[PDB]
Amino acid sequence: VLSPADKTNVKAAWGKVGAHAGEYGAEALERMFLSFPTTKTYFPHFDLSHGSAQVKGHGKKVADALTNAVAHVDDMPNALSALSDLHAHKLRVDPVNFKLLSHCLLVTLAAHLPAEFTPAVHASLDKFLASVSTVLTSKYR
Amino acid sequence: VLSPADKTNVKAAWGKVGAHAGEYGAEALERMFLSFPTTKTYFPHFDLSHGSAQVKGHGKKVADALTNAVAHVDDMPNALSALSDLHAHKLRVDPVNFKLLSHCLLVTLAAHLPAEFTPAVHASLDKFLASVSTVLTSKYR
Amino acid sequence: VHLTPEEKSAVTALWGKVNVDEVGGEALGRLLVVYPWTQRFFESFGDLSTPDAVMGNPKVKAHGKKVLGAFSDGLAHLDNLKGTFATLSELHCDKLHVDPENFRLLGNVLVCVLAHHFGKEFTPPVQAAYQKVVAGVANALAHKYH
Amino acid sequence: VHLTPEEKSAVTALWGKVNVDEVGGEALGRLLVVYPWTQRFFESFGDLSTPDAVMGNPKVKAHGKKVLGAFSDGLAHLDNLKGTFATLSELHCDKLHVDPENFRLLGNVLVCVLAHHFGKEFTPPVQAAYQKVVAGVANALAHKYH
Ligand code: HEM
Numbered sequence: 142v143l144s145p146a147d148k149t150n151v152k153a154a155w156g157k158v159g160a161h162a163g164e165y166g167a168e169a170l171e172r173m174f175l176s177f178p179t180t181k182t183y184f185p186h187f188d189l190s191h192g193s194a195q196v197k198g199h200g201k202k203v204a205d206a207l208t209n210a211v212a213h214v215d216d217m218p219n220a221l222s223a224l225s226d227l228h229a230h231k232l233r234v235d236p237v238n239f240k241l242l243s244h245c246l247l248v249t250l251a252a253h254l255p256a257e258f259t260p261a262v263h264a265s266l267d268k269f270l271a272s273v274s275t276v277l278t279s280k281y282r
Numbered sequence: 283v284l285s286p287a288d289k290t291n292v293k294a295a296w297g298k299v300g301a302h303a304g305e306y307g308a309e310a311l312e313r314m315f316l317s318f319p320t321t322k323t324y325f326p327h328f329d330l331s332h333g334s335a336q337v338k339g340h341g342k343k344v345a346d347a348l349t350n351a352v353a354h355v356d357d358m359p360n361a362l363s364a365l366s367d368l369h370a371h372k373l374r375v376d377p378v379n380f381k382l383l384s385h386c387l388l389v390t391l392a393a394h395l396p397a398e399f400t401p402a403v404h405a406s407l408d409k410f411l412a413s414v415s416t417v418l419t420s421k422y423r
Numbered sequence: 424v425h426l427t428p429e430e431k432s433a434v435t436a437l438w439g440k441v442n443v444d445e446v447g448g449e450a451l452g453r454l455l456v457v458y459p460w461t462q463r464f465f466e467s468f469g470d471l472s473t474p475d476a477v478m479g480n481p482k483v484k485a486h487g488k489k490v491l492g493a494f495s496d497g498l499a500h501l502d503n504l505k506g507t508f509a510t511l512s513e514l515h516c517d518k519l520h521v522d523p524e525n526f527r528l529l530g531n532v533l534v535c536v537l538a539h540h541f542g543k544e545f546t547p548p549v550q551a552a553y554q555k556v557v558a559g560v561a562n563a564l565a566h567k568y569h
Numbered sequence: 570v571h572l573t574p575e576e577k578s579a580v581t582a583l584w585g586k587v588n589v590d591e592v593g594g595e596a597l598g599r600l601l602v603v604y605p606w607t608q609r610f611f612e613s614f615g616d617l618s619t620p621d622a623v624m625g626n627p628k629v630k631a632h633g634k635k636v637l638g639a640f641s642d643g644l645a646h647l648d649n650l651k652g653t654f655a656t657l658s659e660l661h662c663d664k665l666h667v668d669p670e671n672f673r674l675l676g677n678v679l680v681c682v683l684a685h686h687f688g689k690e691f692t693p694p695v696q697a698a699y700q701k702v703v704a705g706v707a708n709a710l711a712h713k714y715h
Pocket residue numbers: 180183184202203206207224228232234238239242243273274277
């Protein structure tokens with residue numbers, strides 16, 4: 142659902158993320174692969190080693206999809222309509238894996254925005270990433 | 283989401299459930315308590331023993347909420363609006379527990395409707411109960 | 424897997440009736456049908472496009488057969504489930520990389536199929552007894568994940 | 570909990586820096602704040618109405634302290650986590666009845682709090698090393714659930 146207090150918190154902390162957007166995006170990725178190996182099975186054609194420009198380019202890609210979400214939050218379904226088919230229809234990504242990325246995504250933000258990552262905002266992002274996850278796994282339900 | 287093929291499957295098998303509705307409702311309940319004890323913590327004022335008229339009355343109550351869902355499927359959120367607050371705000375039911383009931387609910391149906399419980403319908407109900415669960419845990423996200 | 428002696432009678436007596444040929448295929452198939460993402464692991468099984476194509480696929484009925492073999496087996500080794508599945512654990516774990524959560528999803532379908540075939544005989548007590556079993560196996564298989 | 574020797578250096582060196590007084594409260598509190606249903610178990614802790622009331626509640630900071638005690642403890646007994654937590658397992662299991670899933674949710678928050686306090690020092694490798702630890706504890710605590 143997301144409350145106005147939530148979408149205001151999300152919009153602020155992401156504002157603060159600024160141009161490091163695509164960077165934090167590649168950091169979450171790298172974190173997930175190292176913590177949850179079982180996820181690497183989706184990126185064979187990727188050289189998941191620390192400097193991978195491939196992992197980098199995808200991170201930028203992930204950040205942007207999240208940015209597209211914050212700026213259209215009151216209507217994500219229609220917005221991520223396309224990424225839904227891709228992740229659920231074509232790639233068949235296990236739904237569990239979204240909970241694992243959302244986590245490394247909060248750990249990446251918390252390690253970069255000590256001032257903003259307050260419990261309240263912490264909770265707001267978690268709902269946001271939860272909602273983003275539901276949309277991408279919508280073409281399953 | 284639920285496809286037309288899904289809402290047609292759901293509407294049929296529930297049709298077949300007929301008047302045993304409130305009965306199957308008390309059966310799922312009993313099944314959940316015995317299989318997943320950790321759930322009994324929500325029903326202290328209930329005598330969860332096999333014949334409990336209390337468990338019975340609640341089962342009728344559960345079936346009806348599910349019937350209200352099938353007949354208004356294209357708009358559950360607004361329909362279960364109220365039960366959302368109750369389960370999420372007032373009772374604080376762990377979200378995991380919805381996955382455990384949805385299961386005993388499919389095991390109860392399968393043991394009563396051998397002819398209808400085909401893989402296709404099996405999948406449709408599962409999406410239905412998944413969607414019903416998301417609505418009741420909506421006041422969390 | 425503790426299992427009291429009358430939970431034992433439940434599980435046991437039921438098992439000996441299970442069509443150990445068809446049932447194993449009924450469960451792996453409904454898995455791919457109800458939890459699509461699992462198809463990802465059996466692309467080499469051929470056309471898995473409709474619930475029909477899946478329920479009819481020979482590779483499927485030929486694989487569930489084995490899968491049920493691992494259950495029968497487990498069912499007569501409750502004392503030590505980890506050992507019995509060490510090889511299978513390792514395989515599904517550091518080789519295929521199946522998320523342990525899918526072992527629980529497979530156990531639950533297996534349970535639905537059993538409720539399907541025995542209808543009323545499969546009472547709550549027999550189910551509660553069998554749910555403990557599916558949980559035991561699901562955890563032994565995910566042990567190599569430590 | 571296998572843990573290679575350089576994963577050991579990571580975890581260890583980090584731990585000795587953790588404010589073992591405040592951190593334990595930072596995690597239990599964000600738990601109740603981010604996963605509301607958990608409040609159900611600490612109604613006797615007083616007003617838990619706002620993230621402020623919660624982050625300020627003394628019972629909270631006084632309970633997380635203990636909770637972190639169980640981690641420090643676990644951290645120096647990786648060899649046997651089950652034993653160390655047998656008493657706590659039994660308690661959270663057949664007494665309070667906490668769904669084992671909440672042990673994983675608590676481990677992950679604890680991990681966020683650690684990333685929060687050490688910012689850049691808490692690299693991916695140090696996190697991957699710590700994620701294994703949170704998983705180990707979360708499973709030892711749920712052992713009595715068999
Ligand atoms: C927070 C949720 C996620 C978002 C917002 C997201 C977003 C994206 C985007 C935008 C693309 C590229 C689309 C394009 O430009 O064509 C993509 C591709 C992909 N994603 Fe995700 N993703 C998420 C989670 C995941 C997870 C959990 C997995 C599995 C670990 C996954 C696996 C993939 C794969 C395999 C690709 C294709 C990569 C390639 O072939 O180059 N995604 N994702």
